[PDB]
Design a protein around this ligand. Structure first.
Ligand SMILES: CCCCCCCC/C=C\CCCCCCCC(=O)OC[C@H](COP(=O)(O)O[C@@H]1[C@H](O)[C@H](O)[C@@H](OP(=O)(O)O)[C@H](OP(=O)(O)O)[C@H]1O)OC(=O)CCCCCCC/C=C\CCCCCCCC
Ligand SMILES: CCCCCCCC/C=C\CCCCCCCC(=O)OC[C@H](COP(=O)(O)O[C@@H]1[C@H](O)[C@H](O)[C@@H](OP(=O)(O)O)[C@H](OP(=O)(O)O)[C@H]1O)OC(=O)CCCCCCC/C=C\CCCCCCCC
Ligand SMILES: Nc1nc(=O)c2ncn([C@@H]3O[C@@H]4COP(=O)(O)O[C@H]5[C@@H](O)[C@H](n6cnc7c(N)ncnc76)O[C@@H]5COP(=O)(O)O[C@@H]3[C@@H]4O)c2[nH]1
Ligand SMILES: Nc1nc(=O)c2ncn([C@@H]3O[C@@H]4COP(=O)(O)O[C@H]5[C@@H](O)[C@H](n6cnc7c(N)ncnc76)O[C@@H]5COP(=O)(O)O[C@@H]3[C@@H]4O)c2[nH]1
Ligand SMILES: CC(C)CCC[C@@H](C)[C@H]1CC[C@H]2[C@@H]3CC=C4C[C@@H](OC(=O)CCC(=O)O)CC[C@]4(C)[C@H]3CC[C@]12C
Ligand SMILES: CC(C)CCC[C@@H](C)[C@H]1CC[C@H]2[C@@H]3CC=C4C[C@@H](OC(=O)CCC(=O)O)CC[C@]4(C)[C@H]3CC[C@]12C
Ligand SMILES: COc1cc(C(=O)O)ccc1NCc1ccc(C2(C(C)(C)C)OCC(C)(C)CO2)cc1
Ligand SMILES: COc1cc(C(=O)O)ccc1NCc1ccc(C2(C(C)(C)C)OCC(C)(C)CO2)cc1
Lengths: 318, 318, 318, 318
């Protein structure tokens, strides 16, 4: 979280520690109450069996919908749909057999089955299966089910991986042909996702000077596709203080626009979260990329009395 | 789903219908067993209360972690963390009060609380909270937690929304200055995410003719940023069958690249699913967008003896 | 397994199916014997508890050795060594607490602990912890703990990924400057790992003609490093039948040499297994590589009356 | 371990010493409890018998899978499959007979057999057979199931074994034809697996001078295959401090590339561990090899303000 304090760090294992504490407390309580541990084990196994039966019923309900997509999503394989709706069928079947055995054989099975089915049907019909926001966010981060992930990887693959290697050569060409621009690309990251097309509008102290020699390449059927960069001077008290190849991170614009459109199903809180996740993912990518060797500098900032030029200079002086 | 049969349709409400059938069957079974409805109601309420207590315990365990990211992800408010780990605190508290009342008033409590805590801690520690793939997919599609969503919206907002309005002008200018090219942009959507840099390599019948006039605009500080498109000749039996503005969808490339790098946590099945999702999302956007005044055509194909030129010609002759 | 029938296919899930059958049979037997399921559950839990205690003791024994490598292998972290010797400490501790509870509370703990420690110490001192060859092989394949894996990836990265793209250009140059060599590189894979330096020795029907224009590049501090390929004519009944860019897979030589040297700890059975695994891994890599697009052909063969030239021709004619 | 302190030493016998201590402590505890030794012996034998039965059941489950690969991995002999799934059948049968005899002759059998089968099937289905990382590492190092082993042996057999003998001739030829370069080859071993293509890029003080005479030889059908080495100048304060034949170890590059591709199943921790293992294995090979008549020097370093040229000079001045 060196970019900005507001960047969330990845989740740890606090839930497991709290669960261990809870387990210890529950065991202590059961010991204090002084009840037969045999009954404890019996009822715990029965509870887990009920959970397994509930999973079975919910998966059966979801199977009715998922079979409609058998040819598209699951390649015509019934076993694939079953695995998607229930997980590993072997494990689930073994657990079901064990539950049946330890219920029908321990101190009515069909009545309890009907009751559990009624409860699951109620939970489904009334829309009570929804997870809490924190669990959804954790699942999405673990599985990388985020738009920011794809946006950052697209930014790295399509632009930086094709731009950074030739940046030094282009800079040397511009410097010898013409001034002492720093040998790095400075990428701005406004967590508010406010990305204007002209920096001079955001801060007069930043002023355009010229353009580097255009880079060219063929991309996805389009040939002679050109990437261009701009040179900006940073002023202090009306006098020049630095010069750099500065630009905004274009994908953030998208995050803003997606929040304006209603067809995108994207809100402002999602916008903030995804912008910060984008910054984090891009930092993680660059920290390990061989292309990026002191060639790029990310400047992340959040507007609360704020001067962008001074922010850029605080990094340039280093 | 006119693009390609392999594109899955959005999920419907089959699960709820299955749940209704299950509920009716369970009620019929309970009626047949002849058990008194009051006992059924009591036990159902107790089961729902147990579910609520389990939710509370799991939410506490998750809060133990979220309190760390309080400042960076919840704006320093404990109430937001609680609402994220448990949902609406008012509803949860009401349900907990009702559960306590109807557990103590109906034919111990701390013992079962300890058992439920034990079960929840066991599920957390052993990693049994994992959802089935179908549930995760449904959650992501409903909440738009996919990379394809962002990729498609970026493609529309950064490229098409700026290119389609001015396309006919460039095309007519090229025609006057020189070829009878159709007035429509053609975008290829390979579901295998091939995306070669040279189209002629994919099919010899596809050959370059000339570039349209360049379009220019300022974007994200980079001024005079240039968008260029390429004309292509479609041959049939060694003869000029047609001419069109043709290009691949660049984001697919990214997906492919994301399926190769290990740092992305992206697999090939995820690649195919996200490609289909990207195509469907883009189709919907273009259907609702006003810029797409028949100025674009999407071509989605899946290689099995396949001729890309033939498919493009088929879409052209319409 | 299209290369050769002798190539083993990856392992499936037959063990899990057999385990499910075994579980069903055991449950049926317990039902037939008509003993109290409470006793069954009790003794099953006790057995699992004993297994957990054995794991704890074995991990404690291994910890004494692994602490000597704390600074080198585990970066001075005691928790990392503990996780390496015991797995997730939270889960293991929870299971230990549960085992202690359900043993000391169900119908002497210290005596059984001493007995289990004695048994584990015997198993360690007498070297009885060794796994069977099949389990070791499965573990190595799942974790890619094989020399052939690294050899194949090295062959792809260092040679093919740098050779295939320019192969067509070099072939066209040679053909226009001089005959109609097929536009593919043919790589021989002798599963016996017998790789001579001159093919003419292996089969007179194969005869050297000339060399393609050398490819050049800088690699790992060495500049102007050159890759060269040879052209070979394949004869029939004394008359020419084909011409191709043919070569052996160099890494196989290593596999042979490693079997000759004693310092390598490599046998002939390992040689065969690793050669076949190398072929399989290379095939899997090429099937998904974008560089390989009809540019390479693998010819795997096993000498039992064998003609290499006819083997090459059977692929050339296609 | 003179290369670098971070290189781990081979594992010793600390586990056996800990096991001996544990056994002595357990015997003392049993003596203190005052239990009769005959009961101890009976229960210990029963425990060992249970372990044998579990091994048998797991071996049967694994045989259910290995019978599929019988032809492709065991030469069509069922006895080899049995020996792979169970070990020496004679010893296993003897132990099973003894177990049966001492279980039936000492104070049911089928019931406990069913319980053990249930436990084994449960462990198999739930994936509880996974070894701890330290045990896997020990098994791989003892059996040489690492990629670094093969990479190091390939580096020695393909490059060094063919280059070191003829190095002094080339060096003296270059000296007569022109520079006072040392008579030793210098190999860099970055544990981070950086391996840039240009050394001057890594450190400006490293600059190219000229190439040694090329070495030529026929290899794997490719005749006139060329090995080339490069001389480099080591500067200090802008002055020529030394000249040497310097190069990176190419296989490390491969490791890095394997840590990026997802198809390889190779992580960064595995990358570092395998780099250390490669360095150690190469050191041992060179120590035992006769070609290394002080003709090579290995330089292993780990970047923390680090000057590669200074380290090379330090190794040179000796
Ligand atoms: C049945 C009746 C008997 C019941 C027995 C009751 C036992 C109750 C047990 C356990 C309580 C668990 C509390 C969790 C620890 C506090 C967490 C924390 O506050 O930690 C505080 C510090 C760590 O702090 P930092 O290092 O600064 O933070 C890190 C860092 O930032 C990483 O970088 C980051 O990421 P990573 O590097 O790890 O990837 C990571 O995050 P992550 O770990 O969440 O992933 C962050 O935690 O540890 C500690 O001193 C705790 C040391 C544990 C001491 C031993 C356990 C207690 C003593 C005895 C227990 C009973 C033993 C059994 C005896 C026999 C039983 C019969
Ligand atoms: C407590 C008292 C009551 C106890 C109840 C007793 C129940 C006993 C249960 C289960 C026995 C398991 C046997 C395993 C199947 C045979 C394996 C095989 O021989 O299969 C034969 C074929 C598949 O053949 P192929 O497709 O040609 O081969 C593939 C292919 O090549 C893949 O390509 C490859 O790779 P992948 O594509 O999968 O990746 C893969 O390999 P992999 O699967 O190992 O990974 C290869 O198998 O399936 C079948 O017809 C079996 C269909 C199962 C039928 C349903 C189960 C039996 C009916 C009832 C069971 C009880 C139901 C419960 C009722 C209520 C209970 C109260
Ligand atoms: N600042 C900046 N200057 C550039 O020249 C540039 N070129 C690309 N990018 C950014 O890299 C990322 C990857 O582009 P990708 O091609 O994968 O998707 C691109 C691409 O599919 C399409 N597109 C954009 N510009 C062009 C273009 N000139 N030609 C063809 N397609 C284009 O629309 C997508 C989104 O573009 P932007 O979202 O505005 O910023 C892109 C993008 O975020 C640039 N960013
Ligand atoms: N047939 C053939 N013709 C070639 O020109 C060629 N060049 C490389 N290779 C093979 O690709 C693989 C990757 O080489 P890598 O550099 O990663 O390790 C190489 C490399 O580290 C080193 N080495 C081999 N040749 C050279 C060389 N000319 N210059 C420097 N180092 C070399 O020793 C290792 C093993 O080489 P080979 O095991 O004989 O075959 C190699 C290798 O199997 C070739 N194979
Ligand atoms: C309720 C319990 C007691 C019984 C569980 C039934 C098992 C016998 C099932 C569950 C998982 C099944 C397997 C899941 C996956 C596959 C892969 C499948 O191959 C395919 O991929 C077919 C689809 C396609 O090729 O598109 C062939 C059947 C098989 C082996 C299935 C065989 C039958 C299995 C073991
Ligand atoms: C026996 C049972 C009842 C108690 C189990 C003890 C737990 C409290 C232990 C087990 C795992 C431990 C964690 C394992 C990993 C780490 C990471 C560790 O951070 C490091 O990486 C330190 C080493 C380094 O930085 O090199 C700090 C402690 C912590 C959180 C540990 C905190 C204490 C934990 C939770
Ligand atoms: C990874 O292992 C697990 C996976 C899953 C899953 O796939 O969801 C669930 C639970 C898993 N392990 C915990 C667990 C498994 C089995 C049992 C058990 C006994 C066998 C104790 C006798 O009692 C309850 C039962 C009758 C229902 C089933 O059998 C208890 C606890
Ligand atoms: C992924 O889950 C598992 C992981 C591991 C592992 O880390 O090795 C082992 C076993 C796992 N699940 C199977 C299982 C867990 C727990 C128990 C249980 C009960 C809680 C049934 C009451 O009984 C036995 C016990 C007292 C020893 C522990 O608690 C039975 C079965």
């Amino acid at each position: 979280s060196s970019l900005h304090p507001s960047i969330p760090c990845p989740r740890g294992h606090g839930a497991q520690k709290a669960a261990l504490v809870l387990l210890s407390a529950c065991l202590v309580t059961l010991w204090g109450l002084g009840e037969p541990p045999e009954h404890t084990l019996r009822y715990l196994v029965l509870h887990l069996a009920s959970l397994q039966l509930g999973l079975l019923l919910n998966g059966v309900c979801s199977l009715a919908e998922e079979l409609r997509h058998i040819h598209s999503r699951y390649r015509g394989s019934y076993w694939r749909t079953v695995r998607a709706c229930l997980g590993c069928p072997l494990r689930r079947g073994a657990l079901l057999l064990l539950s049946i055995y330890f219920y029908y054989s321990l101190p009515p099975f069909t009545w309890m089955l009907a009751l559990l089915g009624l409860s699951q049907a109620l939970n489904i019909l009334l829309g009570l299966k929804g997870l809490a926001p924190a669990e959804i966010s954790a699942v999405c981060e673990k599985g990388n089910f985020n738009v920011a992930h794809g946006l950052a990887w697209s930014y790295y693959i399509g632009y930086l991986r094709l731009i950074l290697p030739e940046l030094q050569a282009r800079i040397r060409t511009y410097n010898q042909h013409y001034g002492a621009v720093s040998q790095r690309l400075y990428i701005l990251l406004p967590l508010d996702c406010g990305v204007p097309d002209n920096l001079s509008m955001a801060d007069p102290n930043i002023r355009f000077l010229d353009k580097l020699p255009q880079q060219t390449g063929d991309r996805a059927g389009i040939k002679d596709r050109v990437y261009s960069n701009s040179i900006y001077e940073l002023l202090e008290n009306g006098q020049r203080a630095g010069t750099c190849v500065l630009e905004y991170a274009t994908p953030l614009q998208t995050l803003f626009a997606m929040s304006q459109y209603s067809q995108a199903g994207f809100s402002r809180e999602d916008r903030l979260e995804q912008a910060k996740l984008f910054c984090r993912t891009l930092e993680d990518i660059l920290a390990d990329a061989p292309e990026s060797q002191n060639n790029c500098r990310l400047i992340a900032y959040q507007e609360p009395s704020f001067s962008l030029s001074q922010e850029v200079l605080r990094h340039l002086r280093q």
